[PDB]
Amino acid sequence: FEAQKAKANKAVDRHFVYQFMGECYFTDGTQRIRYVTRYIYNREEYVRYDSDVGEHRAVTELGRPDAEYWNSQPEILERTRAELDTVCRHNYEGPETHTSLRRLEQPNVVISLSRTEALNHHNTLVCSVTDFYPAKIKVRWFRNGQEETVGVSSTQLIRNGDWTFQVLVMLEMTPRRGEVYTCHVEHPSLKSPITVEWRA
Amino acid sequence: AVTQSPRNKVAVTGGKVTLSCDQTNNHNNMYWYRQDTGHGLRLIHYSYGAGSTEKGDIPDGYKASRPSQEDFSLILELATPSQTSVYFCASGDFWGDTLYFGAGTRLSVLEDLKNVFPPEVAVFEPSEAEISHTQKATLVCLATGFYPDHVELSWWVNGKEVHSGVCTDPQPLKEQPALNDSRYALSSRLRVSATFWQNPRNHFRCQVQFYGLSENDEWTQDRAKPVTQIVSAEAWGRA
Amino acid sequence: QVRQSPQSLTVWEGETAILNCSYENSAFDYFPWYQQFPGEGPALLIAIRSVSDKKEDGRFTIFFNKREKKLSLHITDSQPGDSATYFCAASKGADRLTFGKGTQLIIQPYIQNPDPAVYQLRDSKSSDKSVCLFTDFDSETNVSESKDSDVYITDKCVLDMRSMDFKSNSAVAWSNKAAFACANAFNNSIIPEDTFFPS
Amino acid sequence: IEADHVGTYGISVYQSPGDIGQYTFEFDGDELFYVDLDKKETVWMLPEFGQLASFDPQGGLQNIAVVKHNLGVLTKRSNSTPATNEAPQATVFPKSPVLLGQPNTLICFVDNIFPPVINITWLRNSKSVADGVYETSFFVNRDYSFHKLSYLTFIPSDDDIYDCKVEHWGLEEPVLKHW
Q1: Residue A149: in which H helix or E strand, if any?
Q2: Do A5 and C93 touch (CB under 8 A)?
Q3: DSSP track, B62-98
Q4: Are residues A87 and A169 in the same domain?
Q5: How far is A137 from chain D (nearest CA, A)?
Q6: CATH classification of the domain holding C47
Q7: Which structural domain, as residue segments, surrounds residue B58?
Q8: DSSP class of residue D87?
Q9: All chains having 3 or more CB pairs closer than 8 angstroms to chain B
Q10: Which of A16, A108, C96, C193 yields a CA-CA distance of 20 to 30 A from D1?
Q11: How far is the C-alpha of B115 from the C-alpha of B180, rounded, in Å?
């Protein structure tokens, strides 16, 4: 499945940085699609195409000559417009559907104790939930079958940068005789929830 | 415009050949192609701008150079006979729907310059039978024994080039098809009215432009150096 | 891969010429045709995008069949000036083209009054040298090559004497053999029965 | 600006001086691939993705040429207004729960990078280390600055203290993020 790219238009005739990008905003699959290209010089977007407007618009004064010229040439304006179909819709239905949109990586779930156990003394359990994809996830702590919300803290979603995520969930607790603590994880890659238990 | 240079060239194996192309279209992309019967237009190298080049489908034996936006050169460092071809340069815009081609460069790479021969040219006068039967007069031009096949043939009546009533074979024929180094022949017809042919003031010249060696090329044979030259034959009208 | 057929096509003036092309890669989305006249470079003639099934411009039309990955250029009311090599090419994502091998198109003219004859012509410089001219035959007749070595026969050529509203075909034959005559120079060809042979 | 998914199907970045270019595809904040502009190859972040999907690197190389040309134009057009340096910030975290004795990976996430020229290096007990080191390409941010991650393979040990060292034009002295 071949991906296709946005095509940068040619600008009209101590450090400098230029950036160009084509962004495809998908909502409910390809039912709603919005397409925006951006042209950026030293952090300032100066011209852009937006499928909601249907033509290039200058964003600042620097972009005036480009937007007018690009819009005036049918070959340039039509090729940019067509990118909503030929890039966004095409990439989603082809390559994305068989790669990104199908990736399902199961969380490793492990329970750790912060300090050495001592009955009737305060301590912390950490539920480490790691290496999962995609991002949607639910983690909950239970003590003896009842949901705990007090003394519970989760990190934000941690993006590893290698197409997996991580979330660590701490529970401040005091281990007594016979109580069992359970970390409960639900994720689209799991037919049924993962439950891991730590017996006091 | 896209200008190619040179337009014709004979080279020896092992020789170094540079084909240069200049465009004034303010285009960013340039392309080098060769054309050969049975192979079509094959892309050799191309380029999106000065200082960068990209390989085409058949880059082997060829180096490219883009020293500026206007100029794109194809470099043949060790010319081989298989690089004998017609080469076309093209320029176009980024993502361009349209390529703009130059007019072509005929290149012959020869194992040996002793194979190079200029054409002999002869004009055959119309038959009396044609004249009395049709009231028209056909002159025939025969260019023979030339190699390589880089020739351009034209007809000239009373000092001015003509096209009306002319046709020339689309391609030269091999005088000995059994040989790879076979010399070539080419014929052309010029037809006029019998009255025009009968007027002895009128003159008819068959001209063959031949592209061959440089006048600075090395040559030591009994025959004159087969340089680029015009060879002609002329006939005079008669009552 | 972009494949064209046929390699060479001859059509009568006025007839519709049909040039076929097919391709392998289904991503190909842009299909320009280039026209190349002898001694010149190609020039863009007409082009189609995979979203359309037909593109018309004057006498030239592309018909495009995406499912079959087949493509056709129709030239209506073909004129002698349409004789050329036609190249099909394809692109995806506006990246570089890939050309087909080209189809040579020859448009044959109607001959109003066929008057087939074989004439012998003498060299204007040396009367010993001679050439045979087969001329004024209709475009039906095919001039075959010589089965004999040492006898050369050119292909037929149409000349147009514009000021007289007159066109005529011809082919030339010659030889260095001592025993060569015009009357059978074109014997390996299908010569008209009415052919004039003066000598 | 709201969506279930965002594909960035072509990010082109070019810098002067230095003729520094980068070409990448992103989907939902992760890198599909970059195009190696020297080797002229598409390099997928996940090798399994590259087996199912493909991208012709020439699509990236031509985009980089356009953007090189545009930079020259926009530089003149703006009276050679130069980029303003930012101060990058680093965060250091392990990939897996840390267990003494067991091979793991330290990740240094560096944000607010602009311009996107940076040196990110690792210190173990203040001495240079580079075991299994890998860096991502520069990722785009909404404010047109960038972020980037570096990875270091390591064996956790209580005798070992780590620093992510970041040098950038917008920093007077190198910043050390301790872990």
Answers
A1: none
A2: yes
A3: -EEE--SSSEEEEEESS--GGG-EEEEEEEE-TT-S-
A4: no
A5: 16
A6: 2.60.40.10
A7: 1-111
A8: -
A9: A, C, D
A10: A16
A11: 11
Range of the domain at A190: 102-200
Give the whole-angstrom CA distance, residue C155 versus residue B86.
23
For D73, other C-beta atoms within 10 Å of its C-beta total: 17
Contact indicator for D42, D52 with CB cutoff of 8 Å: no
Residue numbers of the domain that contains C168: 110-197
CB-CB contact of A158 with A137 (8 Å): no
| Cα B235 from Cα C121, distance rounded (Å) | 13
D95 touching B (Cβ < 8 Å): no
The residues of chain D that CATH labels 3.10.320.10 are: 3-82
Is the domain of B99 the same as that of B152? Answer: no
Buried residues in B176-212 as b, exposed as e (16+ CB within 10 A): eeeeeeebbbbbbbbbbbbeebeeeebebbbbbbbbb
Gap from B85 CA to chain C (nearest CA, Å): 13
Query: Do A72 and A80 meet the contact criterion of CB atoms below 8 Å apart?
Result: no
Q: What's the CATH code, domain D83-179?
A: 2.60.40.10
CA dihedral A8, A12, A14, A15 (to 10 degrees): -10
Which residues in chain D (76-135) have CB-CB distances under 8 A to chain A? 77-78, 80-84, 93, 95-97, 107, 109, 114-117
The resolution in angstroms reads 2.2
CB B212 within 8 A of CB B224: no
Give the tokens for residue D10. 């072509």
Distances (CA, A) of D96 to A55, A165, A168, B14, D46: 48, 11, 10, 62, 19
How far is Cα D18 from Cα D169, in angstroms, rounded to an integer? Answer: 15
* A7–C contact, CB cutoff 8 A: yes
- Please tell me the distance from the alpha carbon of residue D48 to that of residue D33, in angstroms, as a whole number: 12
Chain A nearest C-alpha distance from D128 (Å) = 23
Name the domain boundary from C47, C82, C109: C109
Domain end point (choices A101, A133, A167): A101
CB D78 within 8 A of CB D21: no
The percent of chain D in helix, strand and coil, each rounded to the nearest 5, is 15, 45, 40
Kindly state whether B40 is in contact with chain C, defined as any CB-CB distance less than 8 angstroms: yes
Picking from C131, C163, C198, the residue whose alpha carbon sits closest to that of residue B192 is C163
Residues B188 and B72 in one domain: no
